[PDB]
Design a protein around this ligand. Structure first.
Ligand code: GSP
Ligand code: GSP
Ligand code: MG
Ligand code: MG
Lengths: 190, 183
């Protein structure tokens, strides 16, 4: 049906618009401004690229600009995947992903079984990796791995302002493509 | 609320009032703080299809304000025009050229996808009473050329789309047709 909706959720200022621009254009968002309301960009995605079953899909990235009233629940309809974005320099943004994710999966809590049972693909992306001093890099990656595990989610950590963070063939780009393939599969080829 | 997705494009020149209109349609409140819309903005109009009947069904109607200009060759935004169930064509009543460009916007979509159309003129309040006659003649031609209902309004007046108003009846009928012709 070619239609795919992926929410991009996280606290204000964590880098959602910068990430989406990188995912959709392989270019850094040079002039980021405060996102008002819901911004949508489209990633033209080759499903199963390189295979005889290769098929192009338009993946909508819905960049919701709210904070954890309940009027943004209307944006959470018909969701096929969720990207949960946190700022690695800002532990509070990481904590709030427990609220961001529940806000969709229900429409200050953590229920491990709710995430064992959830079928909507989840991807946890930590931004501003470049700002993490290497002495503390190890500690933040351990914390972030446990975060991905709580959500039963793949994790990617990157610098949204570095085009090599998502350059073709890179480890990040492969994980991103795998996530988008899973979104498409669970909506259609299930 | 239905899980079916309903997509309405909101097209028109920059600055004609698209964000103010969308915000009024989706929130029944005036956009107090309008800024230059960067990229594609989406808001949701919650619409009760067949309200009052045993078949009443709620739809989330996506209003996609894609943006851009009809002077480009850019024009990579064609992927935003897929799976369209309706189009709102917005022009500024004080700006005749924005009305002429609606002919370009419509062709740009009908080359890059009968989709229901609604033609909305903004800034009615800026129309001097002397020029009201000329502006009604012009907008009737848009309605006829696009085979569309037409609404002219002031997006900065909250009552311009209030429930029970003639404008709200036309809007509701348009959204019914969007649903009836798709989803
Ligand atoms: N160094 C570095 N800066 C980043 C990174 N990601 C985002 N930024 C910067 O952080 C600021 C916020 O980025 P932005 O993309 O606007 O966040 P946002 O989540 O969209 O913010 P908002 O719209 O809810 S206000 C910008 O100045 C941007 O350049 C990153 O990975 N590394
Ligand atoms: N008097 C009056 N002013 C209006 C009306 N509609 C919009 N405006 C004003 O016109 C200006 C532009 O409105 P806006 O809603 O931002 O247009 P836009 O098409 O979204 O502009 P852009 O995002 O492409 S830059 C705003 O100052 C707004 O308050 C109207 O019906 N009457
Ligand atoms: Mg933003
Ligand atoms: Mg605007």
């Amino acid at each position: 049906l070619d239609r795919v909706k992926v929410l991009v959720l996280g606290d204000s200022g964590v880098g959602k618009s910068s990430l989406v621009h990188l995912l959709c254009h392989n270019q850094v968002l040079g002039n980021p401004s405060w996102t008002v309301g819901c911004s949508v960009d489209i990633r033209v995605h080759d499903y199963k690229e390189g295979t005889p079953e290769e098929k192009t899909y338009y993946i909508e990235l819905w960049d919701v600009g709210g904070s954890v009233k309940s009027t943004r629940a209307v944006f959470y309809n018909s969701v096929n995947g969720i990207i949960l974005v946190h700022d690695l320099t800002n532990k509070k943004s990481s904590q709030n992903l427990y609220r961001w994710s529940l806000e969709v999966l229900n429409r200050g809590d953590y229920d491990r079984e709710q995430f064992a049972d959830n079928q909507i693909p989840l991807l946890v992306i930590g931004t501003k990796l470049d700002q993490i001093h290497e002495t503390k890099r190890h500690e933040v990656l351990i914390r972030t791995a446990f975060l991905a595990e709580d959500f039963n989610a793949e994790e990617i950590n990157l610098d949204c302002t570095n085009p090599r963070s998502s350059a073709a063939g890179s480890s990040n780009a492969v994980k991103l493509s795998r996530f988008f393939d899973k979104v498409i599969e669970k909506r259609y080829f299930f």
